[PDB]
Design a protein around this ligand. Structure first.
Ligand code: OXL
Ligand code: ZN
Ligand code: ZN
Lengths: 110, 146
């Protein structure tokens, strides 16, 4: 069936029509997400020289080509819409920041 | 990166780590401002500390760049606001989130790692004279962050 949790790479959950995979350490990722992770990690390890699970660090077994072949998940971007309360809190923050500026408390990095 | 950034932003707006906040600077989703309230178990108690976050093109596979904007007296944070924290370099994973990074920084404020300092003088004071360390950290907090 389909896992109830969320792919920690993209932060979306799993849908019945999506291509996802499960590691031998019992962690689920969309194939596309895990492929990007592995490609990146392979480049990084090379530039300093064992790709590990992003969740628990167990070394992964995988075939990169097989993960890449899978369809990228179709995921609508989640709109950002600040609550009235956050906008209020943001205003109080501006006030605090202004005081810090006046105090010489803000690092510039000219 | 953008879809991931929107996800985090929303997950943070509705359930921020205790005493923290974070959101975009103007219209730019790749540049955020965050705040941390100084932890009560730290000499930063009572202060409010601003941080800047810049996300790299290949986020979340490369770590966000996080720095203090509010001046702070700490062995692992320098006068440029740079932060020496393993999860921001060698121990980054896309399983981490800004929310988790903020929690980790709060922990760092309560419990510095003086054996990996960005500021050797402060690290020396921390290890040899904690009374003095805490006094000065409180003094900077009161002058700059309160
Ligand atoms: O750094 C300062 O200016 C202070 O400690 O008073
Ligand atoms: Zn995913
Ligand atoms: Zn795992």
């Amino acid at each position: 069936n389909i896992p109830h949790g969320q792919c920690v790479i993209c932060l979306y959950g799993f849908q019945e029509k999506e291509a996802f995979t499960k590691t031998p350490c019992y962690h689920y990722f969309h194939c596309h997400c895990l492929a990007r992770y592995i490609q990146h990690m392979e480049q990084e390890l090379k530039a300093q020289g064992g790709v590990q699970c992003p969740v628990c660090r167990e070394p992964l077994v995988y075939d990169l080509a097989s993960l890449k072949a899978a369809p990228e998940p179709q995921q609508p971007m989640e709109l950002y819409q600040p609550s009235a309360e956050s906008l209020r809190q943001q205003e109080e923050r501006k006030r605090l920041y202004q005081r810090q500026q006046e105090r010489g408390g803000i690092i510039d990095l000219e | 990166a953008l879809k991931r950034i929107h996800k985090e932003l929303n997950d943070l707006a509705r359930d921020p780590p205790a005493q923290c906040s974070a959101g975009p600077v103007g219209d730019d989703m790749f540049h955020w401002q965050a705040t941390i309230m100084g932890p009560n178990d730290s000499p930063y108690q009572g202060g409010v500390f601003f941080l800047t976050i810049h996300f790299p093109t290949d986020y979340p596979f490369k770590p966000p760049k996080v720095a203090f904007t509010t001046r702070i007296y700490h062995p692992n944070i320098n006068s440029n606001g740079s932060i020496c924290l393993d999860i921001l370099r060698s121990q980054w994973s896309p399983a981490l989130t800004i929310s988790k990074v903020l929690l980790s920084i709060c922990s760092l404020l309560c419990d510095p790692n003086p054996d990996d300092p960005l500021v050797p003088e402060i690290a020396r004071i921390y290890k040899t004279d904690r009374e003095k360390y805490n006094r000065i950290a409180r003094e900077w907090t009161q002058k700059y962050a309160m």
